[PDB]
A paper describes a structure:
Like other coronaviruses, the spike (S) glycoprotein of SARS-CoV-2 mediates viral entry and also serves as a target for neutralizing antibodies (nAbs). Each monomer consists of noncovalently bound S1 and S2 subunits. Upon binding to the receptor angiotensin-converting enzyme 2 (ACE2), the S1 subunit undergoes a natural shedding process and exposes the S2 subunit to form a stabilized postfusion conformation. We report here the structural and functional basis for the distinct neutralizing activities of three nAbs isolated from SARS-CoV-2 convalescent individuals.
The three antibodies approach the RBD from different angles and are therefore expected to have varying degrees of clashes with ACE2 when bound to the RBD. In comparison, P2C-1A3 deviates to the left of ACE2 with an increased inter-angle of 42°. As a result, the estimated clash volume between the two decreases significantly to ~6860 Å3, and the number of shared RBD-binding residues decreases to nine (G446, Y449, F456, F486, N487, Y489, Q493, Q498, and T500). Similarly, P2C-1A3 prefers heavy chain-mediated binding. Of the 21 paratope residues that interact with the RBD, 14 are from the heavy chain (1 from HCDR1; 5 from HCDR2; 4 from HFR3; 4 from HCDR3) and 7 from the light chain (3 from LCDR1; 4 from LCDR3). The buried RBD surface area is 891 Å2, of which 590 Å2 is from the heavy chain and 301 Å2 from light chain regions. For P2C-1A3, only two (F456A and Y489A) of the four mutations (L455A, F456A, N487A, and Y489A) substantially reduced RBD binding. Additional F486A mutant is particularly detrimental to P2C-1A3 and almost eliminated binding, consistent with the epitope residues defined by structural analysis. F486A appeared to confer complete resistance specifically to P2C-1A3 but had no significant effect on P2B-2F6.
Author numbering:
A (entry chain E): 333 to 526
B (entry chain L): -1 to 211
C (entry chain H): 1 to 133, 141 to 218
């Protein structure tokens, strides 16, 4: 029958910023998970509930794939149990997470000489994200007790700090593209197999 | 669009006096304010920031205070080298707004102006435009009437003048009135003389010169 | 040594464009907000625009909105201002300034640049001595445009007793200057007095010996 459009998710030309991570629903298809592993062009490949071998031998009700961009300093946080700028205020994975986390260095595609100022994370937030919650607010945050009147100024900062992607950057401050595969099981029949 | 209202516009004081300047903000800005001192045509320099705290290298006489709407800058013993315009800047919400600015004068004992006069040299006449200059050097206060007479005849409207700022040491101004003449009007007349009248002088001082030494 | 070196600036035929550049040293520039503030001749400080520490955020004054484009490069620490459709009114000295880090509310400013928006072609001045008659000698800087000149006496080795005056704007439309220095009358035949003018707008640098 059908193939899973995992090639559309990974090899897509546009990725989103972390705060507005793009999630896509993969269903009614069959994809090769051994073949994803047999890349060896991914710098990070960690799976959390599942074996990357036993994935071709499985079926799930829904497969979810979230795609964003972070820096390398931050890649260690796309994991259960992680606390951080990203792990708290941008994109958080629960502690029962079964899935894979895949990320590679996209400095050739995702940075510019003048500054690629188009990817952003949420530096400032009142509380931590719930797992898999999305915050798209652009309210002007408040750090000190003086209010903000919706404009930026000292101790009233804009919540979204642009990554300053230049290629000359060091490894940690280079863009890493990321895709998280979560695998759901519910009473509904299986739709993504091997 | 927080407006800053700063007083005075202009204060004049003598050495060792305590200048006090007030900036009031049109809404609560709760200590997000800085105080600058800008000599003429020069970059503003930082003295106080965070409403009260003194930048490194800013003499201890300067000091800030306030929180919310009322803010003061204080020079506990004014100095000959503090002649400037002083601005406050609000940092609470963009756009950054500034105070009006306060000019500061230094008051000193009257001084008399040493008056030199200068000829059209010997190059300007190759260009056909001669220029006579009259130098009023190191006087106080700033007000001075310079009078240009060409053959005991008053010249109005062929004379431009400009004045220095206060000396960083003794607070005196200097002044230069530049008279302009065609080569034919410089050749038409002999005695050129500069009549200076000033507070410090008991009677009007006049230096002349004869075209032809 | 915190320092913001500004550059560019100068005489722009009205309607044209100019770029303004601010070389940042001495601090973690990528931590600090930044601002472009201009100051008409002997008038207030007008804030014009700013850019967040990340360049995420940006706002312009209504006096320049849409007309000016502010930018920052964060590897070369500079901050840039692209000024288009310049007017008569846009004539000012332009200052860049760090506004604050997330943590240190400590401004600092650059030396400024004279953006001079008019239609007059740049002319180099003429320099005539104001020779002596304690003694007083000087220099005459006439018929230049635009501003500024810089006079320096004996190559910045004679700064005690110098009074360089403001530029008088002549009826011709050309600025005139006057710079004079008083000296020991007796040291006149012994010490040589030379005035150095430098007019970067027309690339003119003169040295008149005064005698
Ligand atoms: C992306 O492109 C390469 C080159 O065609 C291909 O071999 C690779 O498997 C692609 N990735 C996916 C997930 O299909």
């Amino acid at each position: 029958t059908n193939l899973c459009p995992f090639g559309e998710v990974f090899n897509a030309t546009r990725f989103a910023s972390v705060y507005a991570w793009n999630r896509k629903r993969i269903s009614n298809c069959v994809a090769d998970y051994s073949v994803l592993y047999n890349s060896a062009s991914f710098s990070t490949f960690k799976c959390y509930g599942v074996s990357p071998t036993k994935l071709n031998d499985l079926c799930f009700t829904n497969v979810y794939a979230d795609s964003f961009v972070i820096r390398g300093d931050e890649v260690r946080q796309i994991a259960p149990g992680q606390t951080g700028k990203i792990a708290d205020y941008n994109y958080k994975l629960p502690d029962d997470f079964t899935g894979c986390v895949i990320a590679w260095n996209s400095n050739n595609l995702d940075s510019k000489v003048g500054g690629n100022y188009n990817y952003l994370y949420r530096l400032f937030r009142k509380s931590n994200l719930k797992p898999f919650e999305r915050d798209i607010s652009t309210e002007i945050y408040q750090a000190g007790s003086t209010p903000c009147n919706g404009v930026e100024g000292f101790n009233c900062y804009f919540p979204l700090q642009s990554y300053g992607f230049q290629p000359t950057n060091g490894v940690g401050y280079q863009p890493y593209r990321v895709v998280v595969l979560s695998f759901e099981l519910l009473h509904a029949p299986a739709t993504v197999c091997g | 669009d927080i407006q800053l209202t700063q007083s005075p516009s202009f204060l004049s004081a003598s050495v060792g006096d305590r200048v006090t300047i007030t900036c009031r903000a049109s809404q609560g800005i709760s200590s997000y304010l800085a105080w600058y001192q800008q000599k003429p045509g020069k970059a503003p320099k930082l003295l106080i920031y965070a409403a009260s705290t003194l930048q490194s290298g800013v003499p201890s006489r300067f000091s800030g205070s306030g929180s919310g709407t009322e803010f003061t800058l204080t020079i506990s013993s004014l100095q000959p080298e503090d002649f400037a315009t002083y601005y406050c800047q609000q940092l609470n919400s963009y756009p950054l707004t500034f105070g009006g600015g306060t000019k500061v004068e230094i008051k000193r004992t009257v001084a008399a102006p040493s008056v030199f006069i200068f000829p059209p040299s010997d190059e300007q006449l190759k260009s056909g435009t001669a220029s006579v200059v009259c130098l009023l050097n190191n006087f106080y206060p700033r007000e001075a009437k310079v009078q240009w007479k060409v053959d005991n005849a008053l010249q109005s409207g062929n004379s431009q003048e400009s004045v220095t700022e206060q000396d960083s040491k003794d607070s005196t101004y200097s002044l230069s009135s530049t008279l302009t003449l065609s080569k034919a009007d410089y050749e038409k007349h002999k005695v050129y003389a500069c009549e200076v009248t000033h507070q410090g002088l008991s009677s009007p001082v006049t230096k002349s010169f004869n075209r032809g030494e | 040594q915190v320092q913001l070196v500004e550059s560019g600036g100068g005489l722009v035929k009205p309607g044209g464009s100019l770029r303004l550049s601010c070389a940042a040293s001495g601090f973690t520039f990528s931590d600090y907000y930044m601002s472009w503030i201009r100051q008409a001749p002997g008038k207030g400080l007008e804030w014009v625009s700013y850019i967040s520490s990340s360049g995420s955020t940006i706002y312009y004054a209504d006096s320049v909105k849409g007309r000016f484009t502010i930018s920052r490069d964060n590897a070369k620490n500079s901050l840039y201002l692209q000024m288009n459709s310049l007017r008569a009114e846009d004539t000012a000295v332009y200052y860049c300034a760090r506004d604050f880090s997330h943590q240190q509310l400590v401004p600092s400013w650059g030396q400024g640049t004279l953006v001079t928006v008019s239609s007059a072609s740049t002319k180099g001045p003429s320099v005539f001595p104001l020779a002596p008659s304690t003694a007083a000698l000087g220099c005459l800087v006439k018929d230049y445009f635009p501003e500024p000149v810089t006079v320096s006496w004996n190559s910045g080795a004679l700064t005690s007793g110098v009074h360089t005056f403001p530029a008088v704007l002549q009826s011709s439309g050309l600025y005139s200057l006057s710079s004079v220095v008083t000296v020991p009358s007796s040291s006149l035949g012994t010490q040589t007095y030379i005035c150095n003018v430098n007019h970067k707008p027309s690339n003119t640098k003169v040295d008149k010996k005064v005698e």
